[PDB]
Amino acid sequence: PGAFPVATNGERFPWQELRLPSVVIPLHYDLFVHPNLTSLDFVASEKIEVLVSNATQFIILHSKDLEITNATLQSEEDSRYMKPGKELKVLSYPAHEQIALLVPEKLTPHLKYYVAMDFQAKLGDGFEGFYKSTYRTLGGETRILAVTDFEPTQARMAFPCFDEPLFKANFSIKIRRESRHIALSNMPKVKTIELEGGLLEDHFETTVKMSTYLVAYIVCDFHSLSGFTSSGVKVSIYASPDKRNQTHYALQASLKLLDFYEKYFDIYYPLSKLDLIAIPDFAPGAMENWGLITYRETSLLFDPKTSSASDKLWVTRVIAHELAHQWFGNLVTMEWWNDIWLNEGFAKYMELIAVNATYPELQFDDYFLNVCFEVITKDSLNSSRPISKPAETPTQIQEMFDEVSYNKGACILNMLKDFLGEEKFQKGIIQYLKKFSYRNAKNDDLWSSLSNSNAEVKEMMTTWTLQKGIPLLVVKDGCSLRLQQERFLQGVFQEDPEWRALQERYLWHIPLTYSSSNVIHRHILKSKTDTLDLPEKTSWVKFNVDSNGYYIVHYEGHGWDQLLNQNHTLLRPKDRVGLIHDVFQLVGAGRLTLDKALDMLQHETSSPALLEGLSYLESFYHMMDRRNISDISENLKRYLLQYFKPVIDRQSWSDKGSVWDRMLRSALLKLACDLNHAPCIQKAAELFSQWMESSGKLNIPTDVLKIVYSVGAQTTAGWNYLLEQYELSMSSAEQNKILYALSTSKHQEKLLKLIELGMEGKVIKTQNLAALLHAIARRPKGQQLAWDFVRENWTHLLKKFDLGSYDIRMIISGTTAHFSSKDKLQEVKLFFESLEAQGSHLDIFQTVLETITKNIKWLEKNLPTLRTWLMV
Amino acid sequence: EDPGAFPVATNGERFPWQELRLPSVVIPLHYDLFVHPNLTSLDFVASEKIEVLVSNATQFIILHSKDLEITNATLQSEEDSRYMKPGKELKVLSYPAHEQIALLVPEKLTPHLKYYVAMDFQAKLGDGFEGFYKSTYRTLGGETRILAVTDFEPTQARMAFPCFDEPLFKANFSIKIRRESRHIALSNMPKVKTIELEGGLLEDHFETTVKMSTYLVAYIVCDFHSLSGFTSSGVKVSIYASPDKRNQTHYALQASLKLLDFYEKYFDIYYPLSKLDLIAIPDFAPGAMENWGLITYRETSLLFDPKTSSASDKLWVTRVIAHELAHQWFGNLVTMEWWNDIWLNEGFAKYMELIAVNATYPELQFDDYFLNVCFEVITKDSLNSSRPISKPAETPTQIQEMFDEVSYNKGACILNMLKDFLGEEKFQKGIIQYLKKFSYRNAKNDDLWSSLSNSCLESDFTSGGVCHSDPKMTSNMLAFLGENAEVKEMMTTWTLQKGIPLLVVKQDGCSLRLQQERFLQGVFQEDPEWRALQERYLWHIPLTYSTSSSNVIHRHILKSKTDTLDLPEKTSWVKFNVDSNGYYIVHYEGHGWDQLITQLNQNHTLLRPKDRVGLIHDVFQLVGAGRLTLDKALDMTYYLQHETSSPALLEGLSYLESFYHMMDRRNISDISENLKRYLLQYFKPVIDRQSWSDKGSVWDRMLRSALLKLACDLNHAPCIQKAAELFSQWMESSGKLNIPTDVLKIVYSVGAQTTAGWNYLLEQYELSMSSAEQNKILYALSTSKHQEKLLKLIELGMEGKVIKTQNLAALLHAIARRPKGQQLAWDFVRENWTHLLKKFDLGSYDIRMIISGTTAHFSSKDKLQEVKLFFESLEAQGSHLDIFQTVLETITKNIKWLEKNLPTLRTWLMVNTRHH
Ligand SMILES: *[C@@H]1O[C@H](CO)[C@@H](O[C@@H]2O[C@H](CO)[C@@H](O[C@@H]3O[C@H](CO[C@H]4O[C@H](CO)[C@@H](O)[C@H](O)[C@@H]4O)[C@@H](O)[C@H](O[C@H]4O[C@H](CO)[C@@H](O)[C@H](O)[C@@H]4O)[C@@H]3O)[C@H](O)[C@H]2NC(C)=O)[C@H](O)[C@H]1NC(C)=O
Ligand SMILES: CC(C)C[C@H](NC(=O)[C@H](Cc1cc(-c2ccccc2)cc(-c2ccccc2)c1)CP(=O)(O)[C@@H](N)CCc1ccccc1)C(N)=O
Ligand SMILES: CC(C)C[C@H](NC(=O)[C@H](Cc1cc(-c2ccccc2)cc(-c2ccccc2)c1)CP(=O)(O)[C@@H](N)CCc1ccccc1)C(N)=O
Ligand SMILES: *[C@@H]1O[C@H](CO)[C@@H](O[C@@H]2O[C@H](CO)[C@@H](O[C@@H]3O[C@H](CO)[C@@H](O)[C@H](O)[C@@H]3O)[C@H](O)[C@H]2NC(C)=O)[C@H](O)[C@H]1NC(C)=O
Ligand SMILES: *[C@@H]1O[C@H](CO)[C@@H](O[C@@H]2O[C@H](CO)[C@@H](O)[C@H](O)[C@H]2NC(C)=O)[C@H](O)[C@H]1NC(C)=O
Ligand SMILES: *[C@@H]1O[C@H](CO)[C@@H](O[C@@H]2O[C@H](CO)[C@@H](O)[C@H](O)[C@H]2NC(C)=O)[C@H](O)[C@H]1NC(C)=O
Ligand SMILES: *[C@@H]1O[C@H](CO)[C@@H](O)[C@H](O)[C@H]1NC(C)=O
């Protein structure tokens, strides 16, 4: 009997596992909220029409930090619980964030009973649940709004509910409010009824079946700009009144993208309205609430006096990602958080399609390669995880929202789009959605639908979704296709006794694909060793075409050395950087050395190739200047300026030209005075002080703003003028760049004053705190200050953030993942074991542990080689 | 004119007038003023049409204008057809050093004809809490809201609209405002009608005012809420506050109805407007401002909340409200001709606080506190740096310097003296005739005395008329006119002679030799500068005196520098200045003082309660005068063991409390420690009778706080442990349990001695919704002992975000008076003088107390040196203030007091510990 947990009233709680029981099933939530924005609290009532199916003496559902005052169980059918119904005993067990409704009788199956509850709480101050946010206006008034953010386990802090994504229901919502506020929610507002006190109550149309984590409601004081999509949907971009000017690109871009998705998926967006609102203190980048999409202001609003081409590119990506979610996640959602990549993998992949086919000017296809690359860094260590993987606690579910779920989800999806061909792919995607509309899909179900566009493909992708890591292609004599696959790793060489893990079951059904002329050959590799015959022999032979496959190519002999250092356009531009990328991880990996590492092309015109390789050189400089040895840094510095002096001088300090043109300019001039190369750092200072002496009158071109501001930080008369003007500005894009601009100063106290105002949270919003730290810790001057500060104020940072939070995740790897010493590796082994003193376990612990360990062993056996490039 | 070499206007261009006063050839009659502020762009746009009457023909009009962009300016007339509609364009000349503009006339204007001058002007909303400025407050939710407020006195109306900014240029004002949906607009007079406009903006029209000086014009744009009620005469009194504070305006409404009703019966003149608005502005520099029909207050001056406001707080709010309402007659109905006679306003409003509060709220017992008003001004009036009540003044900072202890306190005190001389009903009818005979115009000093002199006692309107219609030539009717004239010469001298007279009386058998001299602290009677300052001083002093044998008040005027009276039968003593109603000190020569102290020591109750507080005040002063040894003043404090009149008790107590702080600043710890022990022993009985909750009278409550603060400032372990518990419980209950208001300040101080309590108090400061509680918390934070915490408060006030700048000077003042922060405040001011000047004008009250509050407590020759050198530094840069001299004289007389009396104080204490 008494094998169960104690409740808060000392009674034993009738359920013992974190997943909810399956016997009670909700169908309909009627939901009343009455928030008060001066009292900063709310009162709320709720009726859940839950259909029983098995005998049960107790209903179980979730609730957190809510005071439940009344709880009644009516029934229309089994009329023992007929009107007024009976009053229910309510037990609470917080360690599973669950409550037990103890019925006095026993519920009997196939009947519908109606659970009503009254509940109340204060508006959150943690930027989760139903919480309070502030914003500044043009005159410096601050006004208050009440927002919801629920993904993934936080809706249970706003109303008691069955808070698992499989428990889809309908949700009618009513909200009481003052006359000076508007109320928005998922659906459009049906009617407004004026009441006794001068208050209004807004009723909203019932929703389609959906998960709890998409329910939304806001109370605020915003204006909007509206337009209509071809389909029959009204799109409104809401924001603070003094920023309605900044909403123009978003309504344009939203109209196109939703037009695209409706035809591309061949499913109409099923709501009458879709609204996009720029929440000023917002923790996520944005959030795919059905019909009411919340954005960070820097993610939605675009001011052409203040915003990069890169910032226009960021806004349009996030407004593709979040519209895509309306199908991947809202229409179809994973049955449980283990297959979270079904929403996020597909959303991040759909963004690449949408922007490419809607905004070609922005040139997003050539950029996409980076996202796999970032996940490959993670995926190449043993700390990584399979794309689908069990997940039970809250903070463990929040761990599933990583670059494995987004980037690698998006890239292995990209692989299969190459193999089956976009035609068969798009038909499969449409069959997948239409089948699973308003329901829940498991990891298997997507492929079992995608395959029938071929029972072969299902176990092919089994190798990719259920197994950790990234395969390695070993090719080995004329027509020599002696294929052998491995598990690519890093910091573990064939020499080492650690390397036996390269052999466990690690067998990928890699869909290899090649060319030795302008034609691609396609063939599967389902075994450790298999092979082919070359038709005739050729100069070079390259497999990974455009790196569209999630594997790195290693030619076992005499193939690398050709690379065409004279005519490079023999090999296509994507394969150009594909080869560049592969010829550094192979260096770290253990097979190749660094002498061929710097092999690469001062006459490369595709900037993707140019920036990718040069960004690779940036890392070498920074990693060495961070340990303060100029013996290898100075050679890297003016090497890059002399050799890349033509290109650098060509650029014209203004925001003119095309998008990769404009991005190449700021990227190039970044280094240009991140190096104290006078010709241009001197340039900034006269523009800088022309503007600083103009006092907001001079206009600086877009693509140089972050550079100019950054340059003029060092003079305290500037740094103090930048901080002061930060407060004044009405562009979150502009003030982000200022905030970077103040992280550049090398004054240890000026740096920490920035951090002190973040902790306070009023002048610099708390949403920016982690990024502010992360910027500082990247400079060598502030690198140790940040590391010190986090360890000194840990318990306070943890009171701000949820610890499965992204801010906590970005603060620790932002402060530690750039280390390369054995000194710091033990010191970070401590304080990770110091925080498992408390119940604080995060996989990012090992990912960063192993990441500094791989930084040691890449200096341990690779730097001697690179001192050897002194020129003169 | 002939000579080109005139002042040079700002565009080249010789400027055609060069006095700072305005010319009186053009007379304004009626201003048509349209204002359109915008509270999200923080600027305003305005238009104005002044109906002027020309007296002598000119080629130019001279106006005041400061910091206002004028865009165009026409002239029209309909009596002079040359400027017939649409009139002519005028050249505008700015001379921004006189704050004057000149409008240049194309054809010289004609006498006796009315013209209309029209200008468009614009400016940003002020930032210095003067002119038409921007203010902000915080709501319960944490929102920040903006409002736009005017404050003009004394010469800032010219920063909001061009005008003839001098008090004698009264006019009617017609005011239209334009605003958004979410704001109300208030002005002096009621809103006649609200027209809607295309775009959804509304325009308010207000009824046109009665004649009025410019400095009283007012207008406000905000979103405040109001509670309302009506007086007996049918005035609509409304209390406005930020919306989450409507609660705290109930007591204000209750008192303003009562006080208004009192004023209308007492003056026998109705308040002439239909409504009176009282509004609690959050970021407000002055404290209160008596604009006709729309009176602005500091929240602490107007709002009351019983859970956090003390009884002292309640008394303060009643005083201020009473004070502002008095101004609607004294100052608005009757305005001084020019700022030299500003005491005609502030002296009478100050005095009327006493009459009104005493008449409507006797529970407050404000009559027993009124003596302190006169003591505070005798401090400064007994120095050479003092000034007469009415002195000339010309420049803006020169004008504002006239609002001091002399204009207010001395003015009130000599009025009170005069009232006792003539009797309440004679005095009332003098006032009534004055206010009725100068209604809607101005008056000067001589005008007041002539009306108060010629007052008629209501039986002078009888059948056998003595004042009016047909008098009989009687022998009292020859004494009436002779007595009236005597009263006028006497009052004249009290307003033109600086200083305060010292009447020294030696009792000789049953003769009594009277002498008068100027009273002077610091300087002894045996000083080389002492006959040089007894120059020419001579007062007509209506004296008063009782005896040991007869309690009948005797009254004789001394106009003669020496004179003598004879009594009926030589009694055991005489006591001059009965109830201390006279603006003079009385020194008893020979045996006079011991006879009076001996009386207090056996049966102290035969001396009238005010006689006692007067006697305590009189000898501690005479110690400073060199005429008495500190011996017998301290010997008078024995007898406070029996004293039951808290006024006398508290006077005596505070002299000893200040000696302690004087020692503690100087680190003279053996006396300071002894002073701690004498106070705690000799007043142990009455200290432990005091409750720790606010349960008795207002005096009982005020005495409770007084004594408990003292016992807790002397680290009396029993009282400090009580307060530490109370604080600990309050902190442990999430700042949610209730502390009694009379001991609230003491508890927050004891809590602020730990870094925990200090930090907790500082975060509660930002969150509190009672500005009385915030005041108390800020004091408590300022009692910290760590120099780091004190500096943080100061710099918090410099930035003005969590601590609003309106409190910065009181903050510095608080820090400076306690030993561990005395030095820090001094260094801050000298190292940030240029920085303090950007926020506050040189003549502002804020600058006055920052200076006096950090320096006037110094008592060593070393510190006098630094102060002179700093003051010299300041005046070398062109900053002169009268406060510089006043501080220097105050410092030196402190130094002298230590040198003549610190030995005797140490000696006395030790003698007392040997006896008890
Ligand atoms: C969130 O919470 C805030 C604060 O709790 C609420 O704001 C308050 O709401 C209350 C209730 O509506 C408001 O109080 C009301 O004010 C009205 C206006 O008062 C002025 O005008 C009247 C008429 O001229 C004058 O009599 C009065 O003195 C003021 O000049 C009153 O009319 C209301 O009175 C009603 O209720 C009382 C109850 O005793 C009855 O006796 C009356 O006859 C009448 O029926 C009432 O007092 C208050 O003003 C609000 N505060 C603020 C700061 O605005 C929000 O409503 C709430 N929001 C939500 C969404 O819940
Ligand atoms: C992904 C995590 C961290 C949760 C949350 N993701 C979002 O913001 C995305 C958009 C986004 C993604 C990323 C990103 C992707 C992959 C791997 C690392 C990071 C960075 C940013 C970013 C960059 C700069 C500045 C600010 C943000 C933005 C909206 P989304 O995926 O469409 C919504 N539906 C998911 C909701 C959610 C789930 C669980 C916890 C919190 C929120 C968040 N904190 O970054
Ligand atoms: C005194 C000057 C500078 C203006 C202003 N006086 C007022 O607030 C009075 C009431 C008042 C008076 C005093 C006071 C009296 C005597 C000698 C020194 C000071 C102190 C306070 C006080 C108490 C606590 C906190 C803050 C202030 C209040 C309203 P009032 O007299 O009816 C209106 N006539 C004055 C308008 C004005 C005139 C000239 C310059 C500025 C404003 C002010 N700053 O103290
Ligand atoms: C400017 O303000 C003055 C106040 O200083 C206003 O004076 C007042 O004007 C009204 C109307 O003209 C007078 O009321 C009238 O009095 C006569 C008695 O002769 C009566 O028969 C009328 O029916 C009415 O009651 C009032 O007495 C007068 N007060 C004073 C003190 O002069 C003046 O009207 C204002 N001017 C403008 C243009 O608004
Ligand atoms: C009602 O619930 C009972 C008990 O949970 C169900 O019986 C279970 O059914 C599952 C379904 O797969 C079986 O695996 C188990 O053997 C049964 N018992 C338990 C303890 O799980 C029953 O099927 C449910 N549905 C009805 C009665 O319609
Ligand atoms: C709950 O949501 C479901 C799914 O969105 C609603 O079902 C649709 O109902 C409409 C109107 O009755 C029909 O035209 C569709 O055929 C239904 N779609 C599906 C997939 O069944 C349902 O009506 C909603 N319930 C409530 C009470 O609003
Ligand atoms: C590296 O050298 C610089 C030279 O200024 C020094 O200031 C810095 O502290 C050094 N870094 C470390 C980690 O010792």
Distance CA B55, CA B57 (A): 7
Name which of A139, A144, A242 is nearest B142 (Cβ-Cβ): A144
Which amino acid appears at position B709 of this protein? K
- Number of Cβ within 10 Å of residue A269's Cβ equals 24
Nearest ligand 4 atom, CA B170 = 5
Give the C-alpha separation, B665 to A364, whole Å.
74
Token pair in block for residue B495: 């307003």
Q: What share of chain B is helix, strand, coil (3-state, %, to 5)?
A: 45, 20, 35
Alpha helices by DSSP H, B733-802: 744-751, 755-767, 771-782, 787-799
- Which tokens go with A57? 């003496």
Query: Which of B192, B210, B335 has the most ligand 4 atoms within 8 A of CB, as the residue to mutate?
Result: B210
Residue appearing with tokens 């997943």? A19
Q: Chain A: residue nearest B136 by CA? A: A141
Ligand-binding annotation for B346, yes or no, is yes
Nearest ligand to the C-alpha atom of residue B296: 3
Interatomic CA distance for residues A736 and B616, integer angstroms: 68
Q: Which of A292, A313, A401, A842 to mutate to test the pocket of ligand 2 (most atoms within 8 A of CB)?
A: A401
Contacts of B275 (CB under 8 A, 6+ apart): B189, B190, B235, B236, B237, B238, B293
Is residue B871 exposed (0-12), middle (13-18) or buried (19+ Cβ within 10 Å)?
buried
Judging contacts by C-beta atoms under 8 Å, the chain B residues touching residue A242 are 40
Question: What SS3 state is found at A237?
Answer: strand
User: CA B765 to CA A28: how far, in whole Å?
Assistant: 47
B773: nearest Cα among B781, B762, B765, B784: B765
Strand partners, B236: B230, B275
Among B649, B712, B725, smallest CA distance to B683 is for B649
Are the beta carbons of B823 and B666 closer than 8 angstroms?
no
Map residue A669 onto helix, strand or coil. Answer: helix
Consult the annotation and say whether A549 binds a ligand.
Answer: no
CA geometry: angle B32, B38, B39, nearest 5 deg: 130
Q: Looking at ligand 6, which residue's alpha carbon is closest to its atom 22?
A: A208
The answer for residues whose C-beta is within 8 angstroms of residue B325's C-beta and 6 or more apart is B256, B259, B260, B263, B276, B295, B356
A399 to A346, A805, B77: CA distances (angstroms): 18, 8, 82
Q: Which residues of chain B are within 8 Å of residue A140 when distances are taken between CB atoms?
A: 136, 144, 146
Peptide bond into A21 cis (omega under 30): no
In angstroms, rounded to a whole number, what is the distance separating the alpha carbons of residues B706 and B714? 13
Chain A residues touching residue B148 (CB < 8 angstroms): none
- Measured in Å, residue B353 CA sits from the centre of ligand 3 at 14
Lookup: tokens for A496: 């080492």
Contact B5, B96 (CB under 8 A): no
Q: In the PDB record, what is the listed experimental method?
A: X-ray
* Non-local CB neighbours of A218 within 8 Å, separated by 6+ positions: A145, A146, A147, A148, A183, A184, A185, A277, A279, A292, A294
The 3 state secondary structure assigned to A708-777 is HHHHCCCCHHHHHHHHHHHHHCCCHHHHHHHHHHHHCCCCHHHHHHHHHHHHHCCCCCHHHHHHHHHHHH
Report chain B's terminal Cα–Cα distance, integer Å: 85
How far apart (Å, rounded) are the C-alpha atoms in residues B152 and B171? 16
**Helix axis angle, B787-799 relative to B771-782, nearest 10°?**
140
Closest ligand 1 atom, residue B140 Cα: 53
The answer to whether the CB of B192 falls within 8 A of the CB of B296 is: no
Please classify residue B285 by burial: count the beta carbons closer than 10 Å to its beta carbon, then call 0-12 exposed, 13-18 middle and 19+ buried: buried
CA quadruple B82, B83, B85, B88: dihedral sign: positive
Rounded CA-CA distance B533/B500 in Å is: 12
Element containing residue A498 per DSSP (H, E): none
Residue pair A291/A187 in contact by the 8 Å Cβ criterion:
yes
The H-assigned helical ranges of A14-93 are none
Phi and psi at residue A116, to the nearest 5°: -110, 145
Min distance A140 CA to chain B CA atoms (Å)? 8
The b/e string for B812-844 (b: 16+ C-beta within 10 A; e otherwise) is bbbbbbbeebbebbbebbeeebeebeebbebbb
Interatomic CA distance for residues A702 and A663, integer angstroms = 11
Q: How far apart are CA A162 and CA A159, in angstroms?
A: 10
Q: Does B734 reach chain A within 8 Å, measured CB to CB?
A: no
The interaxial angle of helices A732-743 and A769-778, nearest 10 deg, is 40
DSSP structure string for B105-127? PSSPPPTT-EEEEEEEEEEEPBS
Q: Is the peptide bond before B86 cis (omega within 30 degrees of 0)?
A: yes
Instruction: Give dist(CA B174, CA B156) in Å, integer.
Output: 19
B-chain CB neighbours of A144 within 8 Å are 141-143
Strand pairing class (A471-475; A552-555):
parallel
B39 to chain A: closest CA residue: A139
Length of chain A: 872
The whole-angstrom separation of Cα B586 and Cα A831 is: 79
**DSSP assignments along A147-214, one per residue:** EEE-TTTTGGGTS-B--STT--B--EEEEEE-TT-EEEESSPEEEEEE-TTS-EEEEEPPPPSB-GGG
Q: For residue A342, count CB atoms less than 10 angstroms from its CB and return exposed for 0-12, middle for 13-18, buried for 19 or more.
A: buried
Would you state the torsion angle of the CA atoms of residues B488, B490, B494, B496, taken in this order, to the nearest 10 degrees? 60
**C-alpha to C-alpha distance for B411 and B351, rounded to whole angstroms:** 8
Give the CA angle between residues A792, A798, A804 to the nearest 5°.
130
CA of B338 from ligand 6 middle (Å) equals 82
Taking the C-alpha atoms of residue A558 and residue B728, their distance in angstroms, rounded to an integer, is: 81
∠ at Cα A652 (A649, A656), nearest 5°?
145
**Using CA atoms, how far apart are residues B309 and B330, in angstroms rounded to an integer?**
30
Q: Which two tokens stand for residue B9?
A: 């206007």
Q: Please, what's the b/e burial string for B237-269 (b: 16 or more CB within 10 A of its CB; e: otherwise)?
A: bbbbbbebbeebbebbbebbbbbbbbbbebbeb
Q: What CA–CA distances, in Å, run from B891 to B307, B383, B635?
A: 41, 11, 26
Rounded to 10°, the helix B861-876/B882-915 angle is: 170
Give residues with Cβ within 8 angstroms of A870, minimum separation 6. Answer: A635
Q: Say yes or no for a CB contact (<8 Å) between B146 and A142.
A: no
Of the candidates B141, B142, B146, which has its C-beta nearest A139's C-beta? B146
Q: Which of B114, B211, B437 to mutate to test the pocket of ligand 4 (most atoms within 8 A of CB)?
A: B211
A37 and chain B in contact, CB less than 8 A = yes
| B-interface mutation test, from A39, A122, A131, A143, most B Cβ less than 10 A away | A143
CA distances from B247 to B222, B297, B740 (A): 18, 16, 19
Helix (H) / strand (E) containing B541: strand B541-547
Handedness of CA A509, A514, A520, A521 (dihedral sign): negative
Cα separation, A389 vs A88, in Å, equals: 38
CA pair distance B210, B173, nearest whole angstrom: 7
The number of C-beta contacts closer than 8 angstroms across A and B is 37
Torsion sign, CA atoms A12, A18, A19, A24: positive
Q: Which of B42, B136, B143 sits opposite A144 (nearest CB)?
A: B143
On whether the CB atoms of residues A175 and A33 are closer than 8 A, the answer is yes
Q: Which atom of ligand 2 is nearest to the CA of A406?
A: 16
One-letter amino acid at B650 equals L
Q: Which residue of chain B has the CA closest to A143?
A: B143
Measured distance CA(A613)–CA(A584) in Å, rounded: 10
Please tell me the number of the ligand nearest to residue B174's CA: 4
Cβ neighbors of A21 (< 8 A, separation 6 or more) are A15, A56, A60
User: Is there a binding annotation on residue A97?
Assistant: no
* B146 interfaces chain A, CB cutoff of 8 Å: yes
The identity of residue A592, as a single letter, is L
Measured at the CA of A27, the angle between CA A21 and CA A33, to 5 degrees, comes to 100
CA distance A71 to A116: 6
Among left, alpha and beta (phi > 0; psi -120 to 50; other), residue B726 is alpha
Sign of CA dihedral B628, B634, B635, B638: positive
Residue B12 DSSP label:
B
Q: How far is it, in rounded angstroms, from Cα A351 to Cα A322?
A: 9
Residue at B763: amino acid letter: E
The whole-angstrom separation of Cα B478 and Cα B44 is 63
How far CA B570 is from CA of A472, B508, B509, B558, B589, in Å, comes to: 125, 9, 6, 21, 16
Q: Could you give the CA distance from residue A432 to residue A452 in angstroms, rounded to a whole number?
A: 10
> Do the Cβ atoms of A279 and A127 come closer than 8 Å?
no
Shortest-distance Cα residue to atom 54 of ligand 1? B243
> A7 is written with which tokens?
């409740």
Q: In this structure, which amino acid lies at residue A44?
A: A
Residues of chain B with Cβ-Cβ distance to A40 below 8 Å are 141-142
Catalytic residue among A297, A322, A403, A604: A322
Residue nearest to atom 58 of ligand 1 (CA): A36
Ligand 2 atom closest to residue A329's alpha carbon, by position in its atom list: 34
Does the CB atom of residue B353 touch ligand 3 within 6 A?
no
Cα separation values, A76 from A58, A79, A84, A351, A438, Å: 18, 6, 11, 47, 27
User: Alpha helices of A553-606 — where are they, by DSSP H?
Assistant: 573-589
| Residue with CA at minimum distance from ligand 5 atom 2 | A54
SS3 label, residue A636: helix
Q: For residue A812, give every residue at least 6 positions away whose Cβ sits within 8 Å of its Cβ, in sequence order, or none.
A: A790, A842, A844, A848
Ligand 1 closest atom vs CA B226? 30
Q: What is the DSSP letter of B638?
A: T
Using CA atoms, how far residue B88 sits from A521, B109, B118, in Å, is 92, 12, 10
In this structure, which residue's CA is closest to atom 6 in ligand 3? B286
Q: How far away, in angstroms, is A374 Cα from ligand 6 center?
A: 42
Element (H or E) spanning B565, and its range? strand B562-566
**A40 interface with B at CB cutoff 8 Å:** yes
Q: Is A325 annotated as a binding residue?
A: yes
> Which tokens belong to A372?
């796999």
Backbone φ and ψ for B294, nearest 5 degrees, come out as -150, 90
Best to test chain B binding among A36, A40, A133, A142 (most B CBs inside 10 Å)? A142
CA dihedral B161, B164, B169, B170 (to 10 degrees): -10
Whole-angstrom distance, CA of residue A251 vs CA of residue B443? 69
B291 is in an annotated binding site: yes
Resolution, rounded to a tenth of an Å?
Answer: 2.7
Q: What's the rounded Cα separation, in Å, for the pair B432 and B267?
A: 5
Rg (C-alpha) for chain A, rounded Å, is 29
Compute the distance between CA of residue B659 and CA of residue B902 in angstroms, rounded to an integer: 10
Taken in order B445, B449, B450, B452, the sign of the CA dihedral is positive
Handedness of CA A338, A340, A345, A346 (dihedral sign): positive
Between CA A316 and CA A311 the distance in angstroms is: 9
User: How far is Cα A299 from Cα A316, in angstroms, rounded to an integer?
Assistant: 8
| Other beta carbons less than 10 A from residue B795's beta carbon | 12
Residue B417's SS3 state is helix
Q: Are strands A286-287 and A292-296 parallel, antiparallel or unpaired?
A: antiparallel
**Rounded (5°) CA angle B562-B567-B569:** 150
Q: Which residue of A has its CA nearest to B182?
A: A180
- Does the beta-carbon distance from B141 to A242 stay under 8 Å? no
Question: Of how many residues is chain B composed?
Answer: 916
Q: Which two tokens stand for residue A870?
A: 């002194």
User: CA A315, CA A309: separation in Å to the nearest integer?
Assistant: 10
Q: Considering only CA atoms, which of B631, B617, B575, B694 is closest in space to residue B312?
A: B694
Lookup: tokens for A81: 């619980």
Angle at A667 between CA A807 and CA A604, to 5 degrees: 130
Cβ distance B15 to B92 under 8 Å?
no
* Cβ count within 10 A of residue B376: 15
Ligand number nearest CA of B229 is 1
Ordered DSSP codes for A439-454 = EEE-HHHHHHHHS---
Q: List CB contacts of A552: < 8 A, sequence separation 6 or more.
A: A376, A470, A472, A473, A488, A544, A582, A585, A586, A589
Mutate to test the pocket of ligand 5, among A23, A51, A54 (most ligand atoms within 8 A of CB): A54
Q: Which residues pair with B227 in a beta bridge?
A: B239
The amino acid occupying position A252 is Q
Please choose, from the candidates B125, B148, B123, the residue with its C-alpha nearest in 3D space to the C-alpha of residue B45: B123
